[PDB]
Design a protein around this motif. Sequence first.
Motif, PDB file in Angstrom:
ATOM      1  N   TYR A   1     -10.876 -40.825  -6.970  1.00 27.56           N
ATOM      2  CA  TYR A   1     -11.276 -40.976  -5.548  1.00 27.56           C
ATOM      3  C   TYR A   1     -11.054 -39.870  -4.559  1.00 27.56           C
ATOM      4  CZ  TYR A   1      -6.492 -41.108  -6.515  1.00 27.56           C
ATOM      5  OH  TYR A   1      -5.234 -40.812  -6.980  1.00 27.56           O
ATOM      6  N   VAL A   2     -10.629 -38.708  -5.055  1.00 29.02           N
ATOM      7  CA  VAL A   2     -10.487 -37.539  -4.209  1.00 29.02           C
ATOM      8  C   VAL A   2     -11.820 -36.858  -4.317  1.00 29.02           C
ATOM      9  CG1 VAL A   2      -9.300 -35.381  -3.817  1.00 29.02           C
ATOM     10  CG2 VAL A   2      -8.054 -37.336  -4.735  1.00 29.02           C
TER      11      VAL A   2
ATOM     12  N   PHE B   1     -14.520 -36.295   6.003  1.00 30.61           N
ATOM     13  CA  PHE B   1     -14.609 -37.716   5.796  1.00 30.61           C
ATOM     14  C   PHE B   1     -15.636 -38.242   6.770  1.00 30.61           C
ATOM     15  CE2 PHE B   1     -10.639 -39.401   3.454  1.00 30.61           C
ATOM     16  CZ  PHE B   1     -11.034 -38.691   2.343  1.00 30.61           C
TER      17      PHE B   1
ATOM     18  N   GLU C   1     -18.461 -41.052   6.390  1.00 31.17           N
ATOM     19  CA  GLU C   1     -18.609 -42.300   7.117  1.00 31.17           C
ATOM     20  C   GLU C   1     -19.928 -42.383   7.823  1.00 31.17           C
ATOM     21  OE1 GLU C   1     -18.893 -42.483  10.483  1.00 31.17           O
ATOM     22  OE2 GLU C   1     -18.953 -44.657  10.718  1.00 31.17           O
TER      23      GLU C   1
ATOM     24  N   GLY D   1     -20.759 -45.077   5.494  1.00 32.65           N
ATOM     25  CA  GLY D   1     -20.188 -46.170   6.239  1.00 32.65           C
ATOM     26  C   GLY D   1     -18.722 -46.207   5.942  1.00 32.65           C
ATOM     27  N   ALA D   2     -18.345 -45.649   4.809  1.00 31.92           N
ATOM     28  CA  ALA D   2     -16.952 -45.610   4.450  1.00 31.92           C
ATOM     29  C   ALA D   2     -16.454 -44.205   4.452  1.00 31.92           C
ATOM     30  CB  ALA D   2     -16.750 -46.205   3.094  1.00 31.92           C
ATOM     31  N   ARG D   3     -15.222 -44.025   4.858  1.00 29.69           N
ATOM     32  CA  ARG D   3     -14.606 -42.685   4.956  1.00 29.69           C
ATOM     33  C   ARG D   3     -14.548 -42.146   3.540  1.00 29.69           C
ATOM     34  NH1 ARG D   3      -9.512 -41.646   7.443  1.00 29.69           N
ATOM     35  NH2 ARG D   3     -10.431 -40.021   8.763  1.00 29.69           N
ATOM     36  N   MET D   4     -14.041 -42.939   2.615  1.00 26.68           N
ATOM     37  CA  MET D   4     -14.063 -42.544   1.192  1.00 26.68           C
ATOM     38  C   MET D   4     -14.486 -43.822   0.474  1.00 26.68           C
ATOM     39  SD  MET D   4     -10.065 -42.410   0.229  1.00 26.68           S
ATOM     40  CE  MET D   4      -9.925 -42.058  -1.519  1.00 26.68           C
ATOM     41  N   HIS D   5     -14.941 -43.737  -0.772  1.00 26.18           N
ATOM     42  CA  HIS D   5     -15.402 -44.929  -1.531  1.00 26.18           C
ATOM     43  C   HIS D   5     -16.774 -45.358  -1.012  1.00 26.18           C
ATOM     44  CE1 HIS D   5     -12.115 -44.200  -3.920  1.00 26.18           C
ATOM     45  NE2 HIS D   5     -11.275 -45.146  -3.526  1.00 26.18           N
ATOM     46  N   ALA D   6     -17.564 -44.379  -0.565  1.00 27.30           N
ATOM     47  CA  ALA D   6     -18.891 -44.612   0.055  1.00 27.30           C
ATOM     48  C   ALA D   6     -19.859 -45.530  -0.698  1.00 27.30           C
ATOM     49  CB  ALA D   6     -19.534 -43.274   0.263  1.00 27.30           C
ATOM     50  N   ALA D   7     -20.154 -45.285  -1.980  1.00 21.30           N
ATOM     51  CA  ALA D   7     -21.199 -46.029  -2.731  1.00 21.30           C
ATOM     52  C   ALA D   7     -22.574 -45.507  -2.310  1.00 21.30           C
ATOM     53  CB  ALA D   7     -21.070 -47.522  -2.648  1.00 21.30           C
TER      54      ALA D   7
END
Lengths: 96, 385, 178, 157, 79, 67, 315, 56, 92
Positions: free
Chosen positions: B63-64, B133, B137, B141-147
């Motif tokens: 996740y980095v 990040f 976002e 929509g997500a800072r990390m773990h976007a998809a």
Amino acid sequence: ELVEVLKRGVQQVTGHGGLRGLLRVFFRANDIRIGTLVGEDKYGNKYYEDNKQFFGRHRWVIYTTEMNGKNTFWDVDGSMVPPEWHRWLHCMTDDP
Amino acid sequence: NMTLNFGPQHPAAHGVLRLVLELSGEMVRKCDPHIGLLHRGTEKLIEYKTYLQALPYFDRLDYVSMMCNEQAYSIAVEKLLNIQPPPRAQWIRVLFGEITRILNHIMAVTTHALDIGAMTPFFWMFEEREKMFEFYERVSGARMHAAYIRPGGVHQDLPLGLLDDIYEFSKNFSLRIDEVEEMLTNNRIWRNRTVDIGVVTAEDALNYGFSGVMLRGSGIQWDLRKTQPYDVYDQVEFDVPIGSRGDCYDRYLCRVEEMRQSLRIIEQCLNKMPPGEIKVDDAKVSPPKRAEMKTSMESLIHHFKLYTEGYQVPPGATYTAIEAPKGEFGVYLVSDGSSRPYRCKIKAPGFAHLAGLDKMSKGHMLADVVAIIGTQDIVFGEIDR
Amino acid sequence: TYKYVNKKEQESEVDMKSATDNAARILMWTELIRGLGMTLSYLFREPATINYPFEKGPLSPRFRGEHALRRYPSGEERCIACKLCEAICPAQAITIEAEPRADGSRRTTRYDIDMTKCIYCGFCQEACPVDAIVEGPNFEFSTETHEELLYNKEKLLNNGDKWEAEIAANIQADYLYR
Amino acid sequence: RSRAEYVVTKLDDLINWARRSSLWPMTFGLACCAVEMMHMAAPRYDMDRFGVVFRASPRQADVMIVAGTLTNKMAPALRKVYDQMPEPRYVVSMGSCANGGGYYHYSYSVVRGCDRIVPVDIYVPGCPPTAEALLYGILQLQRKIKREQKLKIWYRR
Amino acid sequence: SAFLKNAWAKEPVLVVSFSVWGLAIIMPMISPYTKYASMINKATPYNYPVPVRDDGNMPDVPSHPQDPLGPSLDWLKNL
Amino acid sequence: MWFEILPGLAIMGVCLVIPGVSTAYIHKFTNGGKEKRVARVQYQWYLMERDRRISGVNRYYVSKGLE
Amino acid sequence: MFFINILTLLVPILIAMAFLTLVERKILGYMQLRKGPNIVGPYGILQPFADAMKLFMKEPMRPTTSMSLFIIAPTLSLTLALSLWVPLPMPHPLINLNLGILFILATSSLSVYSILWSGWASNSKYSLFGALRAVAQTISYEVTMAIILLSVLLMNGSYSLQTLITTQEHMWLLLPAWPMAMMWFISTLAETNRAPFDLTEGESELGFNVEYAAGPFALFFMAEYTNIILMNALTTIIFLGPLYYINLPELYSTNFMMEALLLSSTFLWIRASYPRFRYDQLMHLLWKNFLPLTLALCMWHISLPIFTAGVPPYM
Amino acid sequence: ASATRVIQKLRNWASGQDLQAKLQLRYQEIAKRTQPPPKLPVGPSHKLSNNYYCTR
Amino acid sequence: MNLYTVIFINILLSLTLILVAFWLPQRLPFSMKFFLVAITFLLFDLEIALLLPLPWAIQTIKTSTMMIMAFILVTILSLGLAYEWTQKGLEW
Ligand code: SF4
Ligand code: SF4
């Protein structure tokens, strides 16, 4: 030069009301900075904006003294901001 | 060689590593790293999930480098379907692919220093990270773990205005890398703790399957991005930063140099990204646009089936490897005709690198072990999977 | 195209001048002083931190944040229990059971998002045909007890009513993109 | 004011303020939530400002942030580190992986929550719980620590 | 000599180290002041100077401190 | 801005000058306005003691030509 | 009176000792683009007192141990450090000692035990090793630390710190003897286990605080920081000689205040700026790089006096 | 920014770089929020003719 | 006495803290290198001693003998160091 910075400093200190006001801000918001009130919500929170400062700190909220009964003089939490004004504070929408 | 069981002492972290070791005083005789402190089942869980609902697992594998990992599954699922993403999506993936490389290197170089004892580089570059990040976002929509990178292209076009900001940042980030340099590249002390520590021969690096900067640092020239181009990394022009006298210091210099080269690739992507669609037009593989599913029957049926059941990939198996920031990240995805995969071994650049800890840290002091875990960018998510 | 980092192109033979310059570098720690200058420089730069309660880090419209169930302007909850939000949830978080309401309409008797199970992917936001389940902007919902994190239809509907004004603005800004 | 009750209310207010102002966080750095806090330690949302120190050894640690999945191989350890922390101690569970199993709930190698292993004080939600969100959670711990009235209970016990 | 050179540029402490060792082993030998140290310190009067009886057979000894006879430290003065 | 670090430094400084001014005025008060005699070697202690005997009991009191 | 003069010279230093941690957690902050602690109190002034009260209230775990070292050791560290301020000649010293610098050298040397005792007292074989690192380096750096002073003294004429105020009435001893100042500064950085030379509390757990929490943690803790000041103050008397006017004694203390704060600021600045040296890298410096320089420059300082007819006046 | 020139000069020098030109803090250069509404392009396969899936 | 007064306050202040601190709340690690260092340390520590009287000895009338002696001591120990370097000693 240096005089200018001192001058703007005085403006800030003298700006937030009397010493009473400055202490109110100095001790609970921990920041003596003056901006333009962009509005006051029905809860009591007062929102300000200083576009001169960096993106991170151009929009701030000075929370109320009492919200929904609870005293919020010192126990200020973020959620106090109303949902309508939450996005303005987080820069989701650039419109007050 | 009194076993010290070091590493449950949160000393190099990068996750939780019980590096049982035998040390005659301050010299390390043998390092037997223990793993699985973060095994979570990512490979078995995926078999019970559909292709699109297994995409979020890949962001969590390492996740980095949140997205670069997603590109590897994407590519893999696209190959099995023999579908390719639209031109704009490809550039996007290379745009966010590189931004992600920077994010990983800022993590690896600055976290390396924090263990060494230099703490100011981390705060300097974590502010730049933060700014990145925000790109994630405002795109996902997500800072990390976007998809964001899905199996058929990107999920949604870039917001109207992101490119401009991924410019302002890029226009300046260099100076930020330059600063770190004036603090560490030539420090009279960084060099000592890093130079001539964990030298890995060229033949040995290929033998232990290092496949990453670790190979490149030893002078072997291999960047899967130039040797086997994926997406449109072929249309860009960058220089692989090969190294000589491979050691912790040399590889570092390589990671600072790819931070530099990625800014060269990002610039181009901003300069040449095409007008177009960001997802394949086959409602068969990519979900229909919401205006279409709310006005056209074939689109609702395709929306309902895609979300509820799945792609239904044709039966086959593929090993697709990209050049994730850590090294070669590959997914071997065996697939029956079903909508849910059958196997998905994730090759983690990191399972191979840790193994090398033993052959790298020999006759080394306790502090040396801390330096070497840093020069392998070990993220226990990818190793443990 | 490759690039050698740390490869000395050639053997510069020591010249006294060179030697002195080097020896001075070791003796009077010249490069170490260089590093101190960099940190002194920032000491003078403006700090980037934000007063967290008073100022908030910016989040744009797509931020997923906390789940909410929306309602039509009239007041009829949007969800019609098609239950594909349950089908596509990666974590098995959403549990939905439904029955025809007295009106005869389709509605969910129980809609439970287990937020501790949820990994905030935002696919549910994606999947809903009526777009009843949305990723609301709020991220501050930390709770003292684990049970509070499990959310039934009434909490989510209430969450929806509280944040509907901003949710509507956020969906308004991003729907063309989707 | 004059009353043994008032003196015992004011003095805990003092004891609570000290614990509230200086919380040293011990961060079990499992999975990725540890990164979303390394961002809290970082300059946009400094934690030190709030008195929370960047990193303190377990022995010196008032709070334990459990970021990331607690596998069944790290559980036996978390409990040890929680058990070896000094008495005044608090736990903040960060991430849907830790407060509940999150993705990986049904795995055979993941404990479905750290609440099963260590008593948890504040649960911070979100797959990568945002860094402000952790900062709100740490601030919520400070609100919980202000409310505690240990001296009052000893006086009327 | 060549090593000397590299030594000046590599391991440039020992070089300086030894150099000083020597320069301190030479300056004393060759200097216009070395002699003064044993004098300046010799002169410093710490213990009372006991006076000798006047057999009257000594012209060298000054009968009074301020007399034009005896030792002088004008060398110390204007040194 | 950096100036905020100053408040802390000031408090440190004020608290590092007190000691030097304090020790150097609690001496000039106890010794009668005259710096405390430093008796490194006995001669000095002798002279000091001699002074005590000369007047009162304290050496700081100092008799002059008018005695 | 003398008692009052003990409060002053102690409390004042303790209050200043507290304000150093604050000026450390803010100067390191601004260097790293962050405000540092400003929310508790005004501008973080109440921050040092806050953590002190938390630390003392927490359970002295006393973790299984040799008890009377888990208690005696912390006390020795604070006692020696606060004690070494007894002779410092800020203007006038408090207890003027004819062999003053030997007192400071001897008292410093005793602190190495506290590290040894704390390491043995914990029952973690890890700690036993961690203490070894500090104890070994302390005595090691002590050897050059002492020789560097002997060079100074021979140009001062005496062991009394009070003499240097008369030696440095025309020029700082940095101009002459600068080569040793640097070597005194680096040795002052090692002996206070500050950053460049902070292997202790290093990868061990980033050694003799491992098992120390609450009140024991605090006392050493306090000790280290007071030392951080004291050693810097000794640099500000021995090498940077503050101007002394006999008519007004406080401009000596005013400049002593200014130079001490700046050199105290410097080791704060050093910490953020440099990575930590390796254990052997550290001893490689002292025994290979510095000790030959110091021993030779020691001889130069026995020769400079004689052949330059400058033998210093005793007393 | 908003730094007295002297501090800037000290900054630039101590760092050795014109850090003012490339400040990290963002000020009124970042894309304004509420950027205009987006009309995204429809890709191929949206033709209403000669679009048989069997051929794609 | 004046020193005794100061020191006992010093111990008292520390014992007070630890006491409140405990009252308010209510196997084979050996490397010759390490031993060797300790030894070297004293050989050097003893020498420091034979070098400490040098401030008083500067004022000695001889001077020539003083320096001749002191230079010999520093040189012979440094050679001891030299052999320590040459040998594996000091090479940890
Ligand atoms: S998808 Fe939208 S509508 Fe269908 S059930 Fe889930 S929430 Fe209710
Ligand atoms: S919660 Fe989401 S983010 Fe935190 S660890 Fe589990 S998966 Fe990674």
